[PDB]
Amino acid sequence: EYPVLQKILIGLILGAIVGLILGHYGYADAVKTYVKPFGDLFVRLLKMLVMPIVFASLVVGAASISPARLGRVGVKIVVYYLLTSAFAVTLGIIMARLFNPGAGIHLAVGGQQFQPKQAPPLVKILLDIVPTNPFGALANGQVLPTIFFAIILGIAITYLMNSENEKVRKSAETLLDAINGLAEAMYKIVNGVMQYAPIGVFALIAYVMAEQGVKVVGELAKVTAAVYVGLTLQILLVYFVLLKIYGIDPISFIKKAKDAMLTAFVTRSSSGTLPVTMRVAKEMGISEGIYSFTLPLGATINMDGTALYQGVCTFFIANALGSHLTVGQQLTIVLTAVLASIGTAGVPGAGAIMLAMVLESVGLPLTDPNVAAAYAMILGIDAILDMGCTMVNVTGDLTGTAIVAKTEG
Amino acid sequence: EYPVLQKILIGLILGAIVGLILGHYGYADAVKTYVKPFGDLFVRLLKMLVMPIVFASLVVGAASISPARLGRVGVKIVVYYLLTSAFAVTLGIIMARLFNPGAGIHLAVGGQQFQPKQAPPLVKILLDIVPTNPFGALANGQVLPTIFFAIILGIAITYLMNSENEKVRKSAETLLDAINGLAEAMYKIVNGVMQYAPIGVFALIAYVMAEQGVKVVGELAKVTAAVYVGLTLQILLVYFVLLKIYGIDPISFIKKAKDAMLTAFVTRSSSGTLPVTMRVAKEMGISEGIYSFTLPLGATINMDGTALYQGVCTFFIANALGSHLTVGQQLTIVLTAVLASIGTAGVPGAGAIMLAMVLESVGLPLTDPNVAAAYAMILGIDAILDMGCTMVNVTGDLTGTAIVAKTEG
Amino acid sequence: EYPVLQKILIGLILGAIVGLILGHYGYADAVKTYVKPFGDLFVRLLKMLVMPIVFASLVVGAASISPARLGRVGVKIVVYYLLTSAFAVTLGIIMARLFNPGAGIHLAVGGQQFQPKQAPPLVKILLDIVPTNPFGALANGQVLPTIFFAIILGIAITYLMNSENEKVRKSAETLLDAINGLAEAMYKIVNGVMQYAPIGVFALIAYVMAEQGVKVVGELAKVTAAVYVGLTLQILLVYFVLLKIYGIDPISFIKKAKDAMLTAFVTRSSSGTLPVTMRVAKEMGISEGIYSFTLPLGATINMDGTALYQGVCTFFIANALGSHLTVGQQLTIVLTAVLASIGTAGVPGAGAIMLAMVLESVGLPLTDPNVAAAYAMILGIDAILDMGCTMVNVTGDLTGTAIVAKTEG
Numbered sequence A, B, C: 001e002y003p004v005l006q007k008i009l010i011g012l013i014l015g016a017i018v019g020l021i022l023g024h025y026g027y028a029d030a031v032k033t034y035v036k037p038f039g040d041l042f043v044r045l046l047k048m049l050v051m052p053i054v055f056a057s058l059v060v061g062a063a064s065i066s067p068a069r070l071g072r073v074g075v076k077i078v079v080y081y082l083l084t085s086a087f088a089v090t091l092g093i094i095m096a097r098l099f100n101p102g103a104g105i106h107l108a109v110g111g112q113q114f115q116p117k118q119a120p121p122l123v124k125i126l127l128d129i130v131p132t133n134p135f136g137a138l139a140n141g142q143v144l145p146t147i148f149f150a151i152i153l154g155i156a157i158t159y160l161m162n163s164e165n166e167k168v169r170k171s172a173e174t175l176l177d178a179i180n181g182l183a184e185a186m187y188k189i190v191n192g193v194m195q196y197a198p199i200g201v202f203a204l205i206a207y208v209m210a211e212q213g214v215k216v217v218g219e220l221a222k223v224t225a226a227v228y229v230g231l232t233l234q235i236l237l238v239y240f241v242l243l244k245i246y247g248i249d250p251i252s253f254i255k256k257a258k259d260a261m262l263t264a265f266v267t268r269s270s271s272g273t274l275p276v277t278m279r280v281a282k283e284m285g286i287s288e289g290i291y292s293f294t295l296p297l298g299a300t301i302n303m304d305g306t307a308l309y310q311g312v313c314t315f316f317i318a319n320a321l322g323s324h325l326t327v328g329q330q331l332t333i334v335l336t337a338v339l340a341s342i343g344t345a346g347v348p349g350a351g352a353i354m355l356a357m358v359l360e361s362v363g364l365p366l367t368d369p370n371v372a373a374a375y376a377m378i379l380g381i382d383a384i385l386d387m388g389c390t391m392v393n394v395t396g397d398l399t400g401t402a403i404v405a406k407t408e409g
C-alpha cells in the first residue's frame, strides 16, 4: 500500500498531465463525466465528517482548556487572522505591480452579465453566530453557529464535572466521553477516507486541468503567474518567517501539514478538508482545546490566499479598462478586503460577494458591462486559481494554530 | 457583582426612562439600530437553550415519574390551562366594559389592509404532535412534537432499565445519564446568560418604549390601561387566589419566579424564556417529572395574558365601529378564544391567526376595511401590550405547574 | 388483553366487511373523515420510530460484525434482491398472460392527464448515498444516506474500542452503549405501538375498502386477481421454495414474520413498517449485524410485489390500446423493471417514476392521452393493489435477510 504522502503526489502529477492532454484534444466534456464523479466522492466523504468532527472535538476542546485561557487563544488567533489577511492583499497589490495583468488589452463588451448579491447587515451576521436551534445549526452546515454552542456546552460540562454532587458528576462525564467517542471515531474515519485520496486527487485536478488548463495560456497566464508566485512568495515570507520568529521548524511544519495542504489544493474547499486540517494538527501535537477552536474559525475567516487573489483581480480589472489605481487607492483596497472577511463571515457565497464589495469600494462596479466582461475572463480560469488560493487559505489556519499553541506551552 | 433580581430591575427602570425620552425626541430610529442589537443577543442566547433544555430535561423527567402519574399530571394541567384562559377572556371582556376603548371614535378607513391566515384542520394539528422524524422535530423548533417523543423515550428508557438483563441495563443508563448531562449543562448556561440579562432587559424595553411608547397616549391609552390593569387584576384574583386555595405562599411564589417573569416581559416570547421558566421551577423544588412536561406545553397552550388582550381587542374593534356586543355574543367570544388555543396549538403565527378566528366568530372579519383600519391602530402599540401579556402568559404556566405539584406531594 | 396475532386479525376482517358495506352505501367520505384519522395515527407512530431504530441499531450492527463479513452480506443480499425482483416482473407477465386484463376494452379518452417526473442521473443517485451532512440525513428521512454513515461509524467505533489506549476505549464504549440504549428503547416502543395495531389495522382498511373496494368489480377485477394470485403464487414459489432450499422452515417463517406482514399490508409503506419488520427479525434470531443493514436497504431496493404489479400493469395498458407485446418485448419490460429499482433507489415518488420509465421502454409513453386514460382506471384501485404489493415487498425483505443469515452461523 505504502503512502499516503507519495501515492497522493503520483495521482496529482499523473492527473495533471492526463488532464492537460486529454482536455486539449477536444475531450474536456469526456472528463466532466466519467472522471470527475470519482473526485466528487472524495469531496463528499470528507465533507461527510466536517460537521461531527467539528462539534464533537470542540465540546471536548473546551473541557480541555480553562475558559479564560480559551478567551486568550481567541484574542490572539483573531489578531493573527486579520494581519495575515492584510499581508496577502498587500502582497497581491505588489505582485500585480511587478506583473502587469492585462495592461494592453481592451476587452470585448457584452458577454456574461453579473449581479452582486447583497452583503447582510454586519449586526445580523454577528448576532446569527448565536444559534437559535443548536440542533438546527448542526442539521445544515452552519460552521460558526455550531462553534458557539460547542464552546458554551464545553464550558458548562467542565463546570458540571467538578461539582460537589457525584450523581451529577457521572452525567457530565458519560456525555463528555461519548462526545469524545464520536470525535475519536471521526478522526479514525479521516484515515479511511484518506486512503481513497489518491483516486480523488487524481480525478479532481484531472478535471480542473482538462476543463480550465487549456485556457491558462495568453494574457490569462500573466494573471495565474502573479497569483501563484504571489502564493509561493507569501508562504516563504509570511509563514516561514512567522514560524521561525516563534521558535518552530518551518521544514518540519510542511512535512506534517502536507496531507492537509494537498487535499485543500485539489478539493478547493477550506471547510471540506477541515477533518484532514484537524487530523494533521492532532498529529502535530497541538492540544484539542486550541486546534478544535482555531481551525474551524480559520476555515471561515482566515482567507489569506483569497485576499491575495482579490488584490490581483482588482488590478486585472483595472488594467483591462486602462484605469491605473493611485497611491491612496491601493491602501483602500486593503481595508475593505480585510473587512470583507467579517462582512461575509458565516454567509454562504463568500468568495463572490466578498470580491463584489472590494471592487465596488475602489470604484469598479460589477454591474458595469465593461467590468463584467473583464471579470468573465477571470472566471474562465477561476478553478486554476482556487486550487492555489485554498491551499494557502488553510496553510495560514495551521500556521496560526501552531503559533497560538506556542504562546501556551 | 450582586443581583440578578435587582440589577435587572435597574436596567428595566433606566431603560424605560431613556427609552421614552430618546424616542420622543425623534431618534426612535437611532434606538432601532445600536441599542436593540444588544437586546436581540439576549433573546437569541435564551432561545439557543430552549430546544436541548426542553428535550433533555423531559427525557429524565419521564425516567423520574410513573407512567400513570405523568398522564394524571397531564389531565390536571390541561384542565387548569383551559379554565385560566377562559378566566382571562372573561376578565378581558369585563375590563373592556369598565373601560371604554374607542367608544366615541370614527376611524380613518383605507390604511393597512390585512389577510387572515387559514387555521389548519384540527385533525392535522392533533396528529401532527406525533412527529414522523424525531430528529426533524428537534432540528427545527417543533416544541410540541419534541414533547411527545421525549416522554415516549423517557417511558421506554425507564422500562429498559429495570429489565432482568444487566447488559441492556447499562445501555439504558449511559443514555439516560448523558441526556441528563445535556439537561444539567443547559441549566448551567441559563445562569450565565442570566448574567447578561440587565443589558438585554435594558436594550429590549429601551427599544419598545422609544419606538412604541410615544404612541401610548390618546384613545390608545384607554386600551393599554384596560389591558394592564386587567393583567394586574388577573394575577391578584386568579393566580393569588388559586395559590392560596391549594396551600402555597403567594408572595414567596412571586419572589422565586420574578426572574422568569421579567425575562418574559422584555423578550415577549413564551418559549424564548422557557429556559429561565424551567430553571425557576427547579429552584422552586418541583420534580423534573412535572415541570419538564407542563412548562413547555404551557408555553404553547396557556396563553392567559393573550386571551385577556383578545378580550379587550374584540371590544376595541366593536366600539370603533359603534356596534355594541350583546349578552349572548359575549359568551361566544369566550368559547372561540379558548378553542383558538387548541385550533392553533403547534402552528406558528398563533397570536395572530388566533385573534383572526376570534373576531370572525362574533361577526367582525379582518378583511373588512372598517375593521382593518381599527386593528391597524391597535398594532401601533402591539409590543407595549405584548410585554404585559407574555409576562402573565408564563405566570400562568408556573402557577399551574405549582398547583399540580401540590396535588402530588 | 391477548393478541397481538389474533386481535389484529379481528380488526382486519371486521374492517373489510364494515368498509365494503359502509362504502357501497355512499358514505365513503364519512369514512375518510372520522375513521381514517385513527389509522393514520398508527402509521405516524410507526414512522416516528423508523429513523432512530434504523440508525441506532445499525451502528451496533457494524460494531457487532466484522467489516469484511458485512461486505459479503451486502454482496449477497443485493444479488438476492435483484433475482427476486426479476422473478416478480417475470411472474407478473406470466400471470398477465394467464389473465387477460382489459383485452376487449376500448377506453374513453380525454380524462386525467399525466406527466412523468424525471429520473435523476444514476451518478447523482449513487454519489448522493454518501451524505454531506449526517445530521442532515437523519433530520429529514434519507434512509440510504443514513445506512452508509451508520456502517462507517460502526466500523470506526469498533476499531476505536480495541485500541491500545484505555482512555480512548471508554469513549468508544459509552457512545456505542448509549446508541444501543436508543436502539433498544425503540424496539421497546414498537411493542407499545403494536398494542394499538388493531385499531389502526381496522381503520386503515376500513378506509381503503370503502373508498376503493366498491370499484374492484368489473374489468378491474381481472386486474386485481392477476396481481393478487400473482403475489400469492410468488410467496408459494419463490420464498417457500427459496427458504426450503436454504434450510429454513417456511411455515414457521410466516408465523414469526406475520406481525411485520400485516402492518405492511395495512400501512402500504415499506419504510413505514420497518420498525416492526426489524423487531420481527430480532425475535427470529438474526444478528443485528445483518438485519439492521439488510432490512433498511430492502425497504428501498427490494420491491418484489411492486415489480409484479409493474408486470400486470404494462400488460393492462397494452391490452386496452389493442397492441399486443411480442416475445422479445416482454423481456425488455423485465430488464428495465429491475434497472428502475436502482434508477430510482433513494429518490421519492419511486413506485410512480419507476413505472413511468417501465412503460416508456416498451413503447407506451404515459403522456399519450390513450395510455393516460387507461392508466387512470388502474389508479382507481391503486390502494387495493398497494396493500398486497407492500406485503410481498417486505416478505422478500425478510426472506432475503433470513437466507443471508443462513449463509453465516
Ligand SMILES: N[C@@H](CSCc1ccccc1)C(=O)O
Pocket: A268, A269, A270, A271, A303, A306, A309, A351, A352, A382, A385, A386, A389, A390, A391, A393
Ligand atoms: N473555496 C475557497 C474560497 S476562496 C477561493 C477562491 C479563489 C479565487 C476565486 C474565487 C474563490 C476556499 O475554500 O478557500
Ligand SMILES: N[C@@H](CSCc1ccccc1)C(=O)O
Pocket: B268, B269, B270, B271, B303, B306, B309, B351, B352, B382, B385, B386, B387, B389, B390, B393
Ligand atoms: N409573543 C407572545 C405571543 S401572544 C402575545 C401578544 C400580545 C399582544 C398582541 C398579540 C400577541 C408570547 O410568547 O406570549
Ligand SMILES: N[C@@H](CSCc1ccccc1)C(=O)O
Pocket: C268, C269, C270, C271, C303, C306, C309, C351, C382, C385, C386, C387, C389, C390, C391, C393
Ligand atoms: N407503498 C409501497 C410502494 S410500491 C406499492 C405500489 C403498488 C401498486 C401501485 C403503486 C405502488 C411500498 O412501500 O411497498
Ligand code: NA
Pocket: A270, A298, A299, A300, A301, A302, A303, A304, A393, A394, A397
Ligand atoms: Na480558510
Ligand code: NA
Pocket: B270, B298, B299, B300, B301, B302, B303, B304, B393, B394, B397
Ligand atoms: Na404561554
Ligand code: NA
Pocket: C270, C298, C299, C300, C301, C302, C303, C304, C393, C394, C397
Ligand atoms: Na421493499
